[PDB]
């Protein structure tokens, strides 16, 4: 409908009403679609993700890192923004958690998930890039942080870029979105001292080749 793929995958507050099919033959977006990446930022290799998802023989969403039990040392409730409102309230993406310091600290974070069930798993996460050093102190406390993510195939260290940027959807900062696929038998790990937005939901799937995306107002 009105959502684009990034909205649907990230869990834009307005894409919650969309139903989920276990298999898709092709993907349809309307030309009027304009819901995704509500917190301004880049979605890396977005076109490649869109291509991979165009046809799926089997798809399921599951909670990869449960919101209430996975992060006892971090605050998983204050992670909201006016850029992604829900019924007028500050909110955030349904499939992601923006962790912030608990009390006055952000203990080093370390998590993993083992994909031993047989489907490939799409894992998304993102990185917060605060407008200023005051926001880094408000949200993470650790002044100089890094984020590290990896698997047997993926390995990347990220470092936040704090700067005042032009204001978009009232934000002077940015949040970038990254993703990878975890092949069966492998594991994905996350490590951070701040600025990491973590998945709570992830998608298990089996892909088909040869389909695509149609942009149209033609009814289904």
């Amino acid at each position, epitope marked *: 409908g009105k959502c684009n793929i990034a909205g649907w995958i990230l869990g834009n507050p307005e894409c*919650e009403s969309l*139903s*989920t*099919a*276990s298999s898709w033959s092709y993907i349809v977006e309307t030309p009027s679609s304009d819901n995704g990446t509500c917190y301004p930022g880049d979605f890396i290799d977005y076109e490649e993700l869109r291509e991979q998802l165009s046809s799926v023989s*089997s*798809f*399921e*969403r*599951f*909670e990869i890192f*449960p919101k*209430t*039990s996975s992060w006892p040392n971090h605050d998983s409730n204050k992670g909201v923004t006016a850029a992604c409102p829900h019924a007028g309230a500050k909110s955030f993406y349904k499939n992601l958690i923006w962790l912030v310091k608990k009390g006055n600290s952000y203990p080093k974070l370390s998590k993993s998930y083992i994909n*031993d*069930k047989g*489907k490939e798993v799409l894992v998304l996460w993102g990185i917060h890039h605060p407008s200023t050093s005051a926001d880094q102190q408000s949200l993470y406390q650790n002044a100089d942080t890094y984020v590290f993510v990896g698997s047997s195939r993926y390995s990347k260290k990220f470092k936040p870029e704090i700067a005042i940027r032009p204001k978009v959807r009232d934000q002077e900062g940015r949040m970038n979105y990254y993703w990878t696929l975890v092949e069966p038998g492998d594991k994905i790990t996350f490590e951070a001292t701040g600025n990491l937005v973590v998945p709570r939901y992830a998608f*298990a799937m089996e892909r088909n080749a040869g389909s695509g995306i149609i942009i149209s107002d033609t009814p289904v």
Partner: antibody
Amino acid sequence: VQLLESGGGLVQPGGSLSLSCAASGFTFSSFAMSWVRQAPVKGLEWVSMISAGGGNTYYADSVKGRFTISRDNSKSTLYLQMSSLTAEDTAVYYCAKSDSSGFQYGRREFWGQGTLVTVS
Amino acid sequence: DIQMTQSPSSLSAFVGDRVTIACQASQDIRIHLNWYQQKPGKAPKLLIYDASNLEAGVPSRFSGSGSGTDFTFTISSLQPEDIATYYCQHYHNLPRTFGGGTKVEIK
């Protein structure tokens, strides 16, 4: 979140009865749902499960089609229709939220309080 | 099917004692094991998932470990509020199954 069960009560041998579970506090349509049975003799066993979109079902082989599992996503309600009831079907039935839309990758689930079905 | 064996069927200990139970799979189930606490009159509450990952709101005295076919559950030092039947459940594949449960009494 909240799962509330109803139906149950006394059914004769044979016959049929409809059980149901109303859900709130979560998007019903986003998760698979299932039924679990607790007998006074056999502690716990699964009865049936249905995927979030209603596209896939699984039944215990103790049932073999004797019971039908279905959903109404618009009303956030889970149903179990049991037919041809026998003595072994006396148990407390419980509904649960499955942590995945597709069964296979769910890890944890939880139950609301159940209802008692007596066959006599 | 993979049928879990749980032992003892009943355990009793005094408050402050250290309490553990064991459970086995007939097949290697990696770590796809849940532990539940069933208080009388209540649906079982999940305490532990993926063999050792403690669930939200569960007291830190509860723990567990294990892999493959051999699993354990502990409630550390026993409190009177811990009277419950504890159950071993796995989700390696379908059908999901449960062990018989261990009734833990306190005195």
